[PDB]
Design an enzyme around this catalytic site. Structure first.
Site, PDB file in Angstrom:
ATOM      1  N   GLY A 197       0.789  -1.107  -0.010  1.00 41.75           N
ATOM      2  CA  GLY A 197      -0.210   0.013  -0.148  1.00 41.75           C
ATOM      3  C   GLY A 197       0.934   1.125   0.049  1.00 41.75           C
ATOM      4  O   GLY A 197       1.026   2.223  -0.334  1.00 41.75           O
ATOM      5  N   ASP A 198       2.126   1.424   0.679  1.00 35.45           N
ATOM      6  CA  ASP A 198       3.226   2.416   1.072  1.00 35.45           C
ATOM      7  C   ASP A 198       4.016   2.533  -0.444  1.00 35.45           C
ATOM      8  O   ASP A 198       3.354   3.744  -0.673  1.00 35.45           O
ATOM      9  CB  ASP A 198       4.023   1.907   2.161  1.00 35.45           C
ATOM     10  CG  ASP A 198       3.223   1.997   3.201  1.00 35.45           C
ATOM     11  OD1 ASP A 198       2.224   2.928   3.153  1.00 35.45           O
ATOM     12  OD2 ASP A 198       3.850   1.257   4.373  1.00 35.45           O
TER      13      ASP A 198
HETATM   14  N1  LIG Z   1      -1.197 -10.320  -5.198  1.00 37.74           N
HETATM   15  C1  LIG Z   1      -1.578  -9.289  -4.913  1.00 37.74           C
HETATM   16  N2  LIG Z   1      -1.282  -9.023  -6.895  1.00 37.74           N
HETATM   17  C2  LIG Z   1      -0.280  -7.861  -7.516  1.00 37.74           C
HETATM   18  N3  LIG Z   1      -0.822  -6.861  -6.938  1.00 37.74           N
HETATM   19  C3  LIG Z   1      -1.283  -6.471  -5.497  1.00 37.74           C
HETATM   20  C4  LIG Z   1      -1.168  -7.733  -4.403  1.00 37.74           C
HETATM   21  N4  LIG Z   1      -1.718  -7.043  -3.724  1.00 37.74           N
HETATM   22  C5  LIG Z   1      -1.409  -5.694  -3.852  1.00 37.74           C
HETATM   23  N5  LIG Z   1      -1.259  -5.955  -5.281  1.00 37.74           N
HETATM   24  C6  LIG Z   1      -1.337  -3.971  -5.536  1.00 37.74           C
HETATM   25  O1  LIG Z   1      -0.828  -2.875  -3.586  1.00 37.74           O
HETATM   26  C7  LIG Z   1      -1.652  -2.295  -4.231  1.00 37.74           C
HETATM   27  C8  LIG Z   1      -2.026  -2.136  -2.239  1.00 37.74           C
HETATM   28  O2  LIG Z   1      -2.476  -3.135  -1.660  1.00 37.74           O
HETATM   29  P1  LIG Z   1      -4.120  -2.794  -0.599  1.00 37.74           P
HETATM   30  O3  LIG Z   1      -5.506  -2.179  -1.268  1.00 37.74           O
HETATM   31  O4  LIG Z   1      -4.010  -3.857   0.018  1.00 37.74           O
HETATM   32  O5  LIG Z   1      -3.226  -1.702  -0.140  1.00 37.74           O
HETATM   33  P2  LIG Z   1      -3.261  -1.529   1.572  1.00 37.74           P
HETATM   34  O6  LIG Z   1      -4.123  -2.745   2.097  1.00 37.74           O
HETATM   35  O7  LIG Z   1      -2.791  -0.221   1.879  1.00 37.74           O
HETATM   36  O8  LIG Z   1      -1.546  -2.136   2.788  1.00 37.74           O
HETATM   37  P3  LIG Z   1      -1.180  -2.249   3.809  1.00 37.74           P
HETATM   38  O9  LIG Z   1      -1.805  -3.188   4.312  1.00 37.74           O
HETATM   39  O10 LIG Z   1       0.548  -2.957   3.081  1.00 37.74           O
HETATM   40  O11 LIG Z   1      -1.051  -1.126   4.185  1.00 37.74           O
HETATM   41  C9  LIG Z   1      -3.382  -3.384  -4.792  1.00 37.74           C
HETATM   42  O12 LIG Z   1      -4.128  -2.175  -5.083  1.00 37.74           O
HETATM   43  C10 LIG Z   1      -2.051  -4.032  -5.693  1.00 37.74           C
HETATM   44  O13 LIG Z   1      -2.063  -2.819  -6.904  1.00 37.74           O
HETATM   45 MG   LIG Z   2      -2.112   1.244   3.000  1.00 38.57          MG
END
Ligand SMILES: Nc1ncnc2c1ncn2[C@@H]1O[C@H](COP(=O)(O)OP(=O)(O)OP(=O)(O)O)[C@@H](O)[C@H]1O
Ligand SMILES: [Mg+2]
Ligand SMILES: Nc1ncnc2c1ncn2[C@@H]1O[C@H](COP(=O)(O)OP(=O)(O)OP(=O)(O)O)[C@@H](O)[C@H]1O
Ligand SMILES: [Mg+2]
Ligand SMILES: [Mg+2]
Ligand SMILES: [Mg+2]
Ligand code: NA
Ligand code: NA
Lengths: 312, 313
Positions: free
Chosen positions: B258-259
């Site tokens: 996410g970062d």
């Molecule tokens: N399995 C995956 N394969 C490819 N890209 C992924 C995968 N998981 C996540 N991503 C990429 O990472 C981006 C961010 O993931 P997510 O929406 O889960 O962020 P987040 O929940 O804020 O993460 P974090 O828990 O690290 O703060 C997704 O939009 C996607 O583009």
């Molecule tokens: Mg995040």
């Protein structure tokens, strides 16, 4: 200098966090605050030795990581002044550490990572490493590194005619007979000695029994630490030499007490002091230690211990 | 030369330990192993921006301890390449840290020591401190430092006319409407989106509505992270831009994903790319992140993100 104190053992980052309640599986919680301190029995003992202005080496294993950095800074030239020449860092293990969760309910829960302390030692000790212990005034061991290493050291110095003290603090497993037969002085508290011999330890009497059991199993001397009740040196060529506590004006933090006691004791013994002096020198050092918070922070310089010993 | 990415936020030592189960009160257990890493959402985002070769400054608070030096080492001149000119250390607070307990049961438990992240900031920012955000080409914030500091920073940039991105990651508390009023792009994940607006986010229609509610809270643009479903840029009064995941050959460790996504999005934005290019470049960078263990260690360099973009148009 003089023939050094050589501490072979553990070094840990202690990570304290003040918590209301342990989190539930899945749950994220916040702490009031937290502090991460250089610790581990071997490092405490080495730190204590160097503060008592005796030449002191520490032999141990660190990860190449922040906690590793933290331990060396605290023990070395910018800290307690321990010689770290025989400390080795490795890149494939974390520095040992412990998560100490001080719950608000008065309770305390702990997670331990042996890390380098348990996993970074060689199969067979190097000749370098054996060289410092063979040149030691006295060798201090504990049980936060593998018994195999403890045994190899104890055998090297037994050959050399160097005295070795084994602190029993550490893993709750039986001690290998071959270790018990190679050490000079075994050093438990009431708890350890109890779980060691399976016998009870609530009275001087039954304590003295478990010590007989220790003598039986190849141990010439037992230095028992008895918390508030002081301490006793059992030689299986005599009857218990005793020494009570030197009362502390204020007892804030008993953390580090046993390690300070043992190292102080060992320093007096290599300074050729007598058994009674040794016990009292150690009792004085520990007394000063429990009057300050922290383990390595609380350890008294030699001047402070000598000043206190002046009193009657 | 180029107006810098400027990140104001957290820096943590992340302390990971592997245990079979959580301990009970009084119980001392043994972990299988452990590892301490430089992290924190602010440092992660700074490191990601530096690795993508866009001039990046990190603004934050460390303690003058070992964890502190770990962070500086990772981010600085010998590390990712983040300018640290504006990092300040204090003697009365430890560097923030987090104990992450990875259980054998797949369950995780976290303990967070806010430390300098939460307690080493001035009640009022100095002009010395705010000079850097006033010269940013873009500013990124998260919610692992005080709301009050986030507010002062965002206001100083509104007066400066430069885009401010707020990552909702961090505190699971409500967001000060004053903060919402002063940022240009909000960036929640679907779980954060729900908790924030109070609305459900099980479906896209639902998500589009929870975003309508962000729109009613003063934010013109919402960049929603939808994990393995991808992401979407909502701009008030325009058609949502949707971007699926760029599939990873191996999902090793999504930590920092996410970062990476948000910082990569920022870099593409301040460099002037189209929204669709921004989303795609952010998706590609996050794709690479999840294929290596660690957050800061998994962060891709620019040429790789661009390479993954050719072969997955
Ligand atoms: N399995 C995956 N394969 C490819 N890209 C992924 C995968 N998981 C996540 N991503 C990429 O990472 C981006 C961010 O993931 P997510 O929406 O889960 O962020 P987040 O929940 O804020 O993460 P974090 O828990 O690290 O703060 C997704 O939009 C996607 O583009
Ligand atoms: Mg995040
Ligand atoms: N309340 C006290 N006041 C003064 N001195 C004390 C006190 N408690 C302990 N000591 C000193 O510390 C020495 C060792 O303490 P103790 O016997 O508890 O060791 P231990 O249980 O091995 O300690 P640790 O938990 O630190 O490993 C005692 O022999 C005593 O001299
Ligand atoms: Mg005790
Ligand atoms: Mg002890
Ligand atoms: Mg997610
Ligand atoms: Na103490
Ligand atoms: Na990763």
């Amino acid at each position: 200098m003089a023939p050094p104190l050589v501490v072979v053992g553990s070094a840990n980052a202690d990570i304290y966090v003040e918590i209301e309640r342990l989190p539930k599986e899945g749950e994220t919680i916040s702490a009031k605050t937290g502090q991460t301190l250089a610790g581990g029995k071997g490092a405490n003992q080495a730190a204590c030795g160097a503060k008592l202005m005796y030449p002191t080496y520490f032999v141990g294993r660190l990860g190449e990581d922040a906690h590793g950095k933290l331990i060396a800074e605290a023990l070395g030239d910018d800290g307690c002044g321990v010689h770290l020449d025989y400390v080795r860092s490795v890149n494939n293990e974390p520095t040992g550490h412990a998560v100490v969760m001080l719950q608000s309910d008065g309770q305390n829960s702990i997670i331990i990572v042996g890390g380098a302390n348990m996993k970074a030692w060689p199969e067979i000790m190097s000749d370098d490493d054996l060289e410092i212990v063979r040149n030691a005034g006295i060798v201090l061991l504990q049980r936060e590194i593998p018994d195999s290493i403890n045994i190899q050291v104890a055998k090297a110095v037994k050959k050399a005619g160097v005295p070795v003290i084994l602190d029993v603090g550490g893993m709750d497993t039986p001690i290998p007979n071959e270790l018990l037969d190679s050490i000079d002085i075994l050093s438990p508290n009431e708890t350890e000695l109890s779980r060691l011999t399976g016998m009870p330890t609530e009275t001087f009497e039954q304590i003295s029994q478990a010590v007989a059991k220790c003598h039986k199993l190849g141990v010439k001397q037992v230095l028992v630490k008895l918390g508030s009740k002081g301490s006793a040196l059992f030689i299986q060529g005599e009857k218990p030499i005793q020494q009570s506590i030197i009362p502390a004006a204020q007892v804030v933090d008993t953390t580090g007490a046993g390690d300070t006691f043992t190292a102080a004791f060992a320093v007096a013994m290599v300074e050729g002091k007598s058994h009674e002096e040794c016990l009292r020198f150690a009792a004085a050092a520990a007394s000063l230690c429990v009057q300050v918070k922290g383990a390595i922070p609380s350890m008294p310089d030699r001047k402070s211990v000598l000043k206190l010993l002046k009193f009657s």
